[PDB]
Amino acid sequence: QRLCEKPSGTWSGVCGNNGACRNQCIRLEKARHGSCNYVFPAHKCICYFPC
């Protein structure tokens, strides 16, 4: 399947950005991609790792 997502463990609380989220996942969680996905009813930071 696609990239296997992993809930940002370096992030906390509500999320309001995709880039800072992505960037954080890149450097801190060593993720290749990241975004602020909308897991209803809230936006959560999700890092993407090569699956």
Descriptive account of the structure:
This protein is α+β, with helices and mostly antiparallel strands. The protein has one domain (2-51): Knottin, scorpion toxin-like (Defensin A-like, 2-Layer Sandwich). Helix content is 18%, strand content 37%. It has one helix at 19-27, and strands spanning 4-7, 33-39, 42-49. Strands 1-3-2 form a 3-stranded antiparallel β-sheet. The longest helix has 9 residues, at 19-27. It is globular. It starts with a strand and ends with a strand.
Task: Provide a quick synopsis of the model.
Helices cover 18% and strands 37% of the residues. It is α+β, with helices and mostly antiparallel strands and 51 residues long.
Q: What spatial form do the alpha-carbon principal axes imply?
A: globular
Number of strands: 3
- Helix tally equals 1
- Which strands sit side by side, in order, in the main sheet? 1-3-2
Supply Rg. Answer: 10 Å
CATH superfamily: Knottin, scorpion toxin-like
Structural class computed from helices and strand pairing: alpha+beta
Number of domains: 1
H/E element sequence: EHEE
Helix content: 10-25%
Organism: Arabidopsis halleri
Protein name: Putative plant defensin PDF1.1
Keywords: Antimicrobial, Disulfide bond, Fungicide, Plant defense, Pyrrolidone carboxylic acid, Secreted, Signal
Subcellular location: Secreted
